[PDB]
Amino acid sequence: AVTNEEVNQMIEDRKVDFNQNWYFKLNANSKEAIKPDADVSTWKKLDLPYDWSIFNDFDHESPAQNEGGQLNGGEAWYRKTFKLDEKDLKKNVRLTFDGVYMDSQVYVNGQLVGHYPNGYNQFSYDITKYLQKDGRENVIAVHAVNKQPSSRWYSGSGIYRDVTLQVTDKVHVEKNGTTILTPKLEEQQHGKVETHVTSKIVNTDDKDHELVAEYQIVERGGHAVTGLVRTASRTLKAHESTSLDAILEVERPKLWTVLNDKPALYELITRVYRDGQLVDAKKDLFGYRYYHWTPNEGFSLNGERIKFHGVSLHHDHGALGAEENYKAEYRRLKQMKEMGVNSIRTTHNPASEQTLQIAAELGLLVQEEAFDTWYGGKKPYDYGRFFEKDATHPEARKGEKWSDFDLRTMVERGKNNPAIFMWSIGNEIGEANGDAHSLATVKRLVKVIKDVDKTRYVTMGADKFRFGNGSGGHEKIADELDAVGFNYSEDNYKALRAKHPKWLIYGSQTSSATRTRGSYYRPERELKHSNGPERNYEQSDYGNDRVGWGKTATASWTFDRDNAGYAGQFIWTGTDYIGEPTPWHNQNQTPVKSSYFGIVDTAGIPKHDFYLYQSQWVSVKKKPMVHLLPHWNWENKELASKVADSEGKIPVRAYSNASSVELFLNGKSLGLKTFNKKQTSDGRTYQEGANANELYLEWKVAYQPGTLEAIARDESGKEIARDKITTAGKPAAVRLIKEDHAIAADGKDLTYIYYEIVDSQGNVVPTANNLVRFQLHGQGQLVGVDNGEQASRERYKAQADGSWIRKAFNGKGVAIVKSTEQAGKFTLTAHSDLLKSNQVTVFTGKK
Amino acid sequence: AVTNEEVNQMIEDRKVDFNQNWYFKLNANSKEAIKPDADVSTWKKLDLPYDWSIFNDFDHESPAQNEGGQLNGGEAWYRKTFKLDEKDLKKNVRLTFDGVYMDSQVYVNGQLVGHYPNGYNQFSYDITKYLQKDGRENVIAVHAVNKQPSSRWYSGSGIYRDVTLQVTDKVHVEKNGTTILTPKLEEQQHGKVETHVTSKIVNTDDKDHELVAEYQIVERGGHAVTGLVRTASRTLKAHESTSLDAILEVERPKLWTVLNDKPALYELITRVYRDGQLVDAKKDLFGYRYYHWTPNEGFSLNGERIKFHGVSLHHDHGALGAEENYKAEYRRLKQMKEMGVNSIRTTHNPASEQTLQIAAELGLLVQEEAFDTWYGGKKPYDYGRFFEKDATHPEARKGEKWSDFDLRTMVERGKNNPAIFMWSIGNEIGEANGDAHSLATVKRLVKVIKDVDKTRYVTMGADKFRFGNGSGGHEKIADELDAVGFNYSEDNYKALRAKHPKWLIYGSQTSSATRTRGSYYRPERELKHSNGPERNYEQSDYGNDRVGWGKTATASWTFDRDNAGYAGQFIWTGTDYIGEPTPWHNQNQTPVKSSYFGIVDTAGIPKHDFYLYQSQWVSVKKKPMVHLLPHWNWENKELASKVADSEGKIPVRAYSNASSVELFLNGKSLGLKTFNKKQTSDGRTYQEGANANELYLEWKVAYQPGTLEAIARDESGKEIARDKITTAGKPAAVRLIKEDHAIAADGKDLTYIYYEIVDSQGNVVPTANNLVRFQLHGQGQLVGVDNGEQASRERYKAQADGSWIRKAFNGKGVAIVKSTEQAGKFTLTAHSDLLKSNQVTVFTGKK
Ligand SMILES: CC(=O)N[C@@H]1[C@@H](O)[C@H](O[C@@H]2O[C@H](CO)[C@H](O)[C@H](O)[C@H]2O)[C@@H](CO)O[C@H]1O
Ligand SMILES: CC(=O)N[C@@H]1[C@@H](O)[C@H](O[C@@H]2O[C@H](CO)[C@H](O)[C@H](O)[C@H]2O)[C@@H](CO)O[C@H]1O
């Protein structure tokens, strides 16, 4: 009766992007916000997502303090009017918010639909009963409040993630209603794999209906791998719901894995028939994989042993603030993969849909974290105050607290995503001390999850393990988890492992080295929480600065590498983020406003430790590489005296996954050096330098301006990689560097264009801080400028006169341009006082 | 004003598939066919394309004779009713036929729109003035006549290619109205390449309008590579047309080439504005490439010297008859590429849109041929009788003959396709003898083409060069061409080259070896036109049979390989086709009905010479291979006596592109043999066997049943390929072999499922001819069965009782199943008397 193309059309039509044509106003009056035909002339017309905090100036007196990036919050309304199409008049309508920060209220046509306090969890409302009859204008108004301090890092404020509308028949698969399981995958993988599917179907009509479900599995961007599999026709009564179940067999599916960069994904297509008529159809993304984790050997994925080469990531995107964007998140995660990262932790809140989808697409394992606090709170306006209050959401179950409801709906949202392998129910929960209350709480939370999904490790991250020998009442909380995350606790691992032989252990937060891109200080010394005025609000890109409780990248990695029972780590952090500028944390009159912890700066530019990790985690067969530091501009006596040794020599270091590196100064060899090859006690091969604490090769080089070139070779002496640093002359030009020749004309895709200050030969000037002004013409929109400097208080957005400016920092920065909905092109031009201007052009059109 | 997605939607909506819901009736009455509300109950309802001849039984008295496959033609009507949508009431409507064989008439609402005699050329009609006002039902009726004999090969009858409807604004780009040129590509290729575009725009309205065109170039399935480039706004008067022109620059485009299997293609998007409103948009496929051809060095593509490794291909697809199908043509051309083919010749008629598009997509050079005759005719009902008659098409220009009009519109259709590099204006034109009439004709035809397109070689194929020394009046015709095709004229090449130093020469038809898959005869001897009753209507798969005027694959290839000034060849033929069963040509009471010339049989199964060519044309780096012949079942004394030498030994031969092959009999070596490496006088490297006439390695093997295994090695002695033949026991089962696990549910995609007769160990029985019956269940449709046997008179289609049956031939055959528009799956089951049945399942759904 119904064609495949009609089914695919219905799937498409079921969900619409509801982001366009909102009006926004800070401190708006409630009565005006919610009422029909309000005067919106003093409101800002815009397309969502929109984080309103990122447009503020930095404020030394901000109640967020510098931990929150010194950007104020407040309260605001957003409103939108819409009519249902005539064909949709009798349909069920659900409105979904992927994240609204925070304490939100949604009104439809003057009536309160719900209050949702959580700032990060997706939530949705069935709004059908609130809509106007006969297709007259409806008004949605959303109140968002960011009362500070509410957060230990930059949160952003408002509707910072997508909003979608689902329009379905009265009989439909409920929100997150699909469950897909493959309980015998490991045994069945070389033949027919039984794929058990379940659909929660809802009849919102006031008549009984005959119900059939029909399923097909297809390769995502591939071909069908099953026929149609139908359930038995049965009655679903008026206002009731039911779970239909079926088993489909897929022959030799490709297994999802982190060991490729385009892992295999599948989609389940569900068709719903009401009295023999096709009324609903949807798809659900999933993949085939299995895993195992033992105390002494750690983790394995589809039978292959691996370690979590992981990063902790906050949700902000630098100059974009909290605004979620598919392309921004893709760039960041792709950059993490290029470093050899295979896992991410969403610290410390539910992920966007974009993050989770990209992780499944790129092959990254995900630990998704529900809570930064329990009932104790960490900041007076955080989620702590809601944690034990009764959930008032109209779909909450009897007795559910906010914590029950939020945790349940997060798990239901993500329970088919193959990237997700762990659910965290908290990070550094001070009150989780093994008292009777915290014991009751941990068991309640574990059970909420296990009542939805038993296939993923329930965990928590805890720093209590780093104090003394690590033992204490908190151990009883850890016994209730499937896996136990240690924050900065390497020193107590051996003792805790002997005490708890059965625990699945990993580092949920590690290292916490602090680094400023292109800035160097006392390479010969490890500096602990060094925040004196002589540091001038910078940390060392040699990677030798770390906080009091942290470790260098080398110390935390070599520990992990050498211990098979510590299953991996999530580095604090993969990228810089706005706020927590430790070691100047909450020194509010200093200029700092963003973090030093990242391996990559907020502008998306790698610090040198990126290449350290790459050298350790990416095999020489996959991507032979070599990387030199520091720069080669040592004219300035003050810069050089902080770096040069007693003989005036610069320590030049190479990270490489090759067998040897030879360093040349102006064409003359300074000597070939060879990594020492070694084995872990369980047989894993690794390389190190001159001793166990050095993963680089090092030369002490007397300074002669020119070119330093590193030649990396395989064991047989063939060159497989090279890197080169050059002494720059004085600034002569701004140069622009496109990442993309073209992007999609969809009003969503965007591109990162780097700007650099270069001398007259085209060498980047590594000390340069020149002010750059930007012009944009054509079919694009400037949406951000950044240079990653922690101590900068420059705007990320346009100046008050509409202009776009940003200094270089150590030679570099980035401008971010978003496409419009019109095909064509845009040209970005950069200017700087007394330097040559430059422009580049990026085309826009079909994806 | 207008978004990219709206532009792409308009492009899509401009052209629709008009193939569904036609009614067909052989010998229908004209008055009933054309009139409104005819009773169609005695008509067959069907979706086009539909070749009605392929459903006939073979007929010994067919006026087609066996050269035409002994399948009758006749005359038939097709009719379809349709209403214009309300939004389309004032639009221009053009109806396009990609091919109707032949002598067609199209009626719209009782009125004759046109008579088009050509059976292969695409044609279209503006039917706007014939349509009903206010959106009442329109009737299209198409009369097709296949009065025989009209053809030297199987033509098919009726509407055997797609029909499309274009619905556009009154102001629009005319049919084939786009020209795209890159005249400085070779010079500009490393920077910005100027892409000159021209659009013929037509104003069919009776008011003047202001006209602007806007262009963008995009990578096909990639991203934009230009912005929007607009023309100056100017008036286009009522009922007039004009040519707009613009230049776009594309930076370093990827060059289209035959040396990869996914060459780079681009699309030009044109937007047309009428009084500032976007009213028309379309795209045109093209690619960037340049070529050169010199008398002494032959052809080069983008600066790389190559030879045409070419095949001649007829339009029929075996059991599909003349029905054109994208998937069938894709399979065939992909199979040609896997053999090392880089060029095709469309013998001897314009190509379908599918052929030309697939050739651009797979990287095959195309010579498209317009005529099998001029004014002389070859068969009484062929095109000869129309060639010099005045074109009556409503869009013909004053004084145009049918030959002018057909040649012009073919060139206009294909002038942007990067695969097309040569236009042929005839093949073996007997009357092109250099008399005054034929001289006038050749110059007229060359000029028709050069008035449209100067970038492609105008050519002809001629066998007059093979008689005597090759000289004669025909030389004067050849002097008028850009390139001269020699049919079977290798023996006179040296003399003709010395006589005409400036000619660009190639073999437009070569070899014409005759072969039956799996049948072997006197391998020690070259057999010339051997058609005695002892041959039992079979030819030798050793490749040693050829027609009187032909050559073996080896003799024609080694000639080409050794002569740089003979630019390549088009083998007669790439695949078998229905009709011309030489050397039993027009011996009408014999059983033969299909050709022996193909390298691949009509069922798509390679003959052994496929692997000969592959061994010569595909590099060992690209695909190391080895291939053994004959089979290893020599029990039957009569079969063996035609093959075994005087000592009873079987000559076993290996084709390979490797350095050496070692043959093993039942695990025991029969000796490693090594190809002799040699060079052409111009330095091209090649391999040969024991002497210059042997491209294989050969062993004379005393027959012991079991396994023969060939191990092919590189120079250093590493194994890079192997092949294996096994003695089969008696038939025990039918086995089915899927090419596809799944296909699209679009009612167009189809799949080839091979069936084989196997013994109880799963070895193919190479002599087996068992009758197989097929059942199909689920979402598919059987559309063909075939086994490639020339002497078979079995149906390709269903039996008169609706059943599907076909014998194996030498162990094998194929069944072809088409998808429907519903997702799901189909199961094909095969049965055979006293053997085990087998089934396979193919899924259908998203592409
Ligand atoms: C007062 C003090 O020094 N407290 C520290 C904590 O700040 C620290 O927690 C870490 O703090 C950083 C920001 O500086 C970030 O929030 C990390 O996620 C968090 O772990 C803790 C680590 O054990 O030590 C305390 O003593
Ligand atoms: C009577 C005779 O033998 N004539 C032959 C031609 O048939 C032949 O032309 C070829 O014929 C084959 C089919 O047998 C096919 O049509 C080829 O395309 C065509 O070239 C011709 C070749 O020179 O020789 C004649 O003498």
Going from the C-alpha of B556 to that of each of A742, B487, B491, B649, the distances in angstroms are 49, 11, 10, 29
Which tokens in the block code for residue A811? 């030679």
For ligand 2, pick from B379, B511, B531, B549 the residue to mutate: most ligand atoms within 8 Å of CB. Answer: B549
Torsion angle (degrees, nearest 10) of CA B109, B115, B119, B120: -80
Which residues touch A362 (CB under 8 Å, ≥6 apart)?
Answer: A261, A262, A263, A330, A333, A334, A337
User: With a 6 A CB cut-off, is A162 part of the ligand 1 pocket?
Assistant: no
Which tokens in the block code for residue A277? 């008529």
Which residues touch A783 (CB under 8 Å, ≥6 apart)?
Answer: A319, A320, A750, A797, A816, A817, A818
Place of tokens 């500028």: A581
**How far apart are alpha carbons A335 and A604 in whole angstroms?**
8
Give the angle subtended at the CA of A731 by the CAs of A728 and A736, to the nearest 5°. 95
**Strand locations in A295-376, DSSP E?**
298-301, 304-306, 308-313, 343-346, 365-369
DSSP string computed for A113-166? EEEE--SSS-EEEE-GGGSPGGGPPEEEEEEEEE-SS--SS----EE-S-EEEE
User: With a 6 A CB cut-off, is A463 part of the ligand 1 pocket?
Assistant: yes
B739 vs A contacts (CB less than 8 Å): none
User: With a 6 A CB cut-off, is A549 part of the ligand 1 pocket?
Assistant: yes
Which tokens in the block code for residue B436? 């005054």
Considering only residues 592 to 611 of chain A, which have any Cβ-Cβ distance to chain B shorter than 8 Å? none
Among A136, A162, A17, CA closest to A81: A136
Task: Indicate the residue type of B16.
Answer: V
Would you call B534 helix, strand, or coil by DSSP? helix
Q: Are B564 and B680 in contact (CB under 8 A)?
A: yes
Burial class (CB in 10 A: 0-12, 13-18, 19+), A466: middle
As a residue count, chain A comes to 847
Going from the C-alpha of A332 to that of each of A329, A507, A737, A804, the distances in angstroms are 5, 22, 18, 24
The nearest alpha carbon in chain B to A8 belongs to B846
Query: Which helix (DSSP H) or strand (DSSP E) does residue B528 occupy?
Result: strand B527-528
User: With a 6 A CB cut-off, is B587 part of the ligand 2 pocket?
Assistant: no
Which residues touch A703 (CB under 8 Å, ≥6 apart)?
Answer: A634, A640, A644, A648, A649, A650
Query: Which helix (DSSP H) or strand (DSSP E) does residue A409 occupy?
Result: helix A402-414
CB contact under 8 Å between B224 and A779, yes or no, is no
DSSP string computed for B803-839? -EEEE-BTTEEEEEEEE-SS-EEEEEEEE-TTSB-EE
Phi, psi of A758, rounded to the nearest 5 degrees: -125, 155
B746 vs A contacts (CB less than 8 Å): 4-5
The nearest alpha carbon in chain B to A221 belongs to B847
Phi, psi of A354, rounded to the nearest 5 degrees: -60, -50
Q: Is omega for the bond preceding A348 within 30 degrees of 0, making it cis?
A: yes
Resolution of the deposited coordinates, in angstroms? 2.2
B724: Cα within 13 Å, side-chain hemisphere: 10
Q: Are B752 and B816 in contact (CB under 8 A)?
A: yes
CB pairs under 8 A between A and B: 112
- Using the Cβ of B770 and the Cβ atoms of chain A, whether some distance falls under 8 Å is answered with no
A414: Cα within 13 Å, side-chain hemisphere: 34
Going from the C-alpha of B225 to that of each of A545, B222, B228, B459, the distances in angstroms are 46, 9, 10, 35
The nearest alpha carbon in chain A to B744 belongs to A223
User: With a 6 A CB cut-off, is B406 part of the ligand 2 pocket?
Assistant: no
Would you call A289 helix, strand, or coil by DSSP? coil
User: With a 6 A CB cut-off, is B174 part of the ligand 2 pocket?
Assistant: no
Which residues touch B470 (CB under 8 Å, ≥6 apart)?
Answer: B464, B489, B492, B495, B496
DSSP string computed for B9-39? HHHHHHEEE--SSEEEEET--HHHHHSTT--
Would you call B225 helix, strand, or coil by DSSP? coil
Which tokens in the block code for residue A96? 């979904």
Pairing of strands B484-487, B457-462: parallel
Q: Are A819 and A744 in contact (CB under 8 A)?
A: yes
Going from the C-alpha of B821 to that of each of A1, A2, B16, B747, the distances in angstroms are 10, 8, 17, 5
Among A155, A143, A455, A408, CA closest to A286: A455
- Using the Cβ of B305 and the Cβ atoms of chain A, whether some distance falls under 8 Å is answered with no
First to last CA, chain A: 33
Q: Are B736 and B754 in contact (CB under 8 A)?
A: yes
CB contact under 8 Å between B742 and A223, yes or no, is yes
CB contact under 8 Å between A2 and B822, yes or no, is yes
CA of A356 to the centre of ligand 1 (A): 27
User: With a 6 A CB cut-off, is A488 part of the ligand 1 pocket?
Assistant: yes
**How far apart are alpha carbons B671 and B698 in whole angstroms?**
11
**How far apart are alpha carbons A847 and A747 in whole angstroms?**
12
Going from the C-alpha of A600 to that of each of A433, A518, B81, B660, the distances in angstroms are 35, 12, 65, 54
- Dihedral sign, CA of B88, B93, B99, B104? positive
**Smallest-distance ligand from the CA of B428:** 2
**How far apart are alpha carbons B524 and B519 in whole angstroms?**
15
CB contact under 8 Å between A821 and B3, yes or no, is yes
A841 vs B contacts (CB less than 8 Å): 227
Q: Are B387 and B438 in contact (CB under 8 A)?
A: no
Q: Are B466 and B492 in contact (CB under 8 A)?
A: yes
Among A726, A729, A728, A730, CA closest to A832: A730
CB-CB neighbours of A451 under 10 Å: 10
Which tokens in the block code for residue B452? 């449209």
**How far apart are alpha carbons A577 and A796 in whole angstroms?**
13
User: With a 6 A CB cut-off, is B371 part of the ligand 2 pocket?
Assistant: no
Chain centroid to Cα A841, Å, comes to 29
Which residues touch A422 (CB under 8 Å, ≥6 apart)?
Answer: A365, A366, A367, A368, A456, A457, A458, A459, A483
**How far apart are alpha carbons B722 and B709 in whole angstroms?**
7
**How far apart are alpha carbons B840 and B847 in whole angstroms?**
20
Among A5, A38, A12, A10, CA closest to A23: A38
Measured between CB atoms, which of B228, B744, B779 is closest to A823?
B228
CB contact under 8 Å between B227 and A841, yes or no, is yes
Among B703, B711, B558, CA closest to B627: B711
Chain centroid to Cα A728, Å, comes to 36
Task: Indicate the residue type of B259.
Answer: L
- Using the Cβ of A216 and the Cβ atoms of chain B, whether some distance falls under 8 Å is answered with yes
**How far apart are alpha carbons B226 and B219 in whole angstroms?**
10
CB environment A523-558: b (16+ within 10 A), e (fewer): beebbeebbeeebebbbbbbbbbbbeebbbbbbbbb
**How far apart are alpha carbons A541 and A547 in whole angstroms?**
14
CA of A547 to the centre of ligand 1 (A): 9
Tell me the angle at which helices B326-338 and B353-362 cross, rounded to the nearest 10 degrees. Answer: 40
Going from the C-alpha of A814 to that of each of A434, A452, A766, the distances in angstroms are 48, 43, 15
**How far apart are alpha carbons B61 and B53 in whole angstroms?**
15
User: With a 6 A CB cut-off, is B585 part of the ligand 2 pocket?
Assistant: yes
Q: Are B96 and B134 in contact (CB under 8 A)?
A: no
Among A527, A830, A751, A502, CA closest to B224: A751
Among B703, B657, B100, B92, CA closest to B350: B100
Query: Which helix (DSSP H) or strand (DSSP E) does residue B278 occupy?
Result: strand B277-286
Would you call B4 helix, strand, or coil by DSSP? helix
Q: Are B99 and B161 in contact (CB under 8 A)?
A: yes
Which residue has a Cα nearest atom 6 of ligand 2?
B549
For ligand 2, pick from B313, B379, B463 the residue to mutate: most ligand atoms within 8 Å of CB. Answer: B463
Give chain B's domains with CATH numbers: 1-169 (2.60.120.260), 170-290 (2.60.40.10), 291-625 (3.20.20.80), 626-731 (no CATH), 732-847 (2.60.40.10)
Among A669, A632, A638, A637, CA closest to A651: A632
**How far apart are alpha carbons A432 and B36 in whole angstroms?**
84
The nearest alpha carbon in chain B to A744 belongs to B223
DSSP string computed for B419-483? TEEEEEEEES-TT-SSSHHHHHHHHHHHHHHHTT--SSEEEEEESGGGSTTS-STHHHHHTTSSS
Pairing of strands A104-108, A824-831: unpaired
Looking from the CA of residue B428, the nearest atom of ligand 2 is: 20
**How far apart are alpha carbons B640 and B633 in whole angstroms?**
9
CA of B514 to the centre of ligand 2 (A): 13
Torsion angle (degrees, nearest 10) of CA B397, B400, B403, B405: 0
Would you call B630 helix, strand, or coil by DSSP? coil
Torsion angle (degrees, nearest 10) of CA A675, A681, A684, A689: -10
A845 vs B contacts (CB less than 8 Å): 4, 216, 218, 223-224, 269
User: With a 6 A CB cut-off, is A779 part of the ligand 1 pocket?
Assistant: no
For ligand 1, pick from A512, A545, A556 the residue to mutate: most ligand atoms within 8 Å of CB. Answer: A512
**How far apart are alpha carbons A352 and A366 in whole angstroms?**
12
Q: Is omega for the bond preceding B766 within 30 degrees of 0, making it cis?
A: no
**How far apart are alpha carbons B81 and A675 in whole angstroms?**
79
CB-CB neighbours of B623 under 10 Å: 13
**Strand locations in A363-447, DSSP E?**
365-369, 420-427
Picking from A4, A7, A285 by the largest number of B CB atoms within 10 A of its own CB, the best residue to mutate is A4
- Beta bridge partners, B843, equal B742, B825
B252 vs A contacts (CB less than 8 Å): none
DSSP string computed for A795-845? -SS--TTS-EEEE-BTTEEEEEEEE-SS-EEEEEEEE-TTSB-EEEEEEEE
- Beta bridge partners, B344, equal B311, B366
CB environment A632-667: b (16+ within 10 A), e (fewer): bbbeeeebeeebbeeeeebbbbbbbbbbbbbbbbee
Q: Is A69 left (phi over 0), alpha (psi -120 to 50) or beta?
A: left
User: If you ran DSSP here, which 8-state letter would residue B253 be given?
Assistant: P
Pairing of strands B163-168, B229-230: unpaired
For ligand 1, pick from A428, A578, A585 the residue to mutate: most ligand atoms within 8 Å of CB. Answer: A428
Query: Which helix (DSSP H) or strand (DSSP E) does residue B305 occupy?
Result: strand B304-306
**How far apart are alpha carbons A493 and A496 in whole angstroms?**
5
- Using the Cβ of B8 and the Cβ atoms of chain A, whether some distance falls under 8 Å is answered with yes
Which tokens in the block code for residue A595? 């973090």
Going from the C-alpha of B368 to that of each of A798, B314, B356, B407, the distances in angstroms are 59, 12, 9, 11
- Beta bridge partners, B210, equal B235
Q: Are A99 and A316 in contact (CB under 8 A)?
A: no
Which tokens in the block code for residue B369? 């041929």
- Using the Cβ of A217 and the Cβ atoms of chain B, whether some distance falls under 8 Å is answered with no
- Using the Cβ of B843 and the Cβ atoms of chain A, whether some distance falls under 8 Å is answered with yes
User: With a 6 A CB cut-off, is B488 part of the ligand 2 pocket?
Assistant: yes
Q: For residue A837, give how far its alpha carbon lies from the nearest alpha carbon of chain B (Å).
A: 22
Measured between CB atoms, which of B224, B251, B778 is closest to A227?
B778
User: With a 6 A CB cut-off, is B105 part of the ligand 2 pocket?
Assistant: no
Among A278, A214, A219, CA closest to A251: A219
- Dihedral sign, CA of A540, A544, A548, A549? positive
**How far apart are alpha carbons A104 and A475 in whole angstroms?**
36
User: If you ran DSSP here, which 8-state letter would residue A288 be given?
Assistant: B
Which residues touch B638 (CB under 8 Å, ≥6 apart)?
Answer: none
A439: Cα within 13 Å, side-chain hemisphere: 8
Encode B718-752 in three state secondary structure.
CEEEEEEEECCCCCCEEEEEECCCEEECCCCCEEE
User: If you ran DSSP here, which 8-state letter would residue B233 be given?
Assistant: P
Going from the C-alpha of A168 to that of each of A128, A133, A202, B196, the distances in angstroms are 11, 17, 11, 49
**How far apart are alpha carbons B806 and B602 in whole angstroms?**
14
Place of tokens 């080409």: B560
Q: Is omega for the bond preceding B346 within 30 degrees of 0, making it cis?
A: no
B741 vs A contacts (CB less than 8 Å): 223, 225, 251
Task: Indicate the residue type of B613.
Answer: Y
**Smallest-distance ligand from the CA of A581:** 1
Place of tokens 């309300």: B86
Would you call A755 helix, strand, or coil by DSSP? strand
DSSP string computed for A430-495? TT-SSSHHHHHHHHHHHHHHHTT--SSEEEEEESGGGSTTS-STHHHHHTTSSSEEEES-HHHHHH
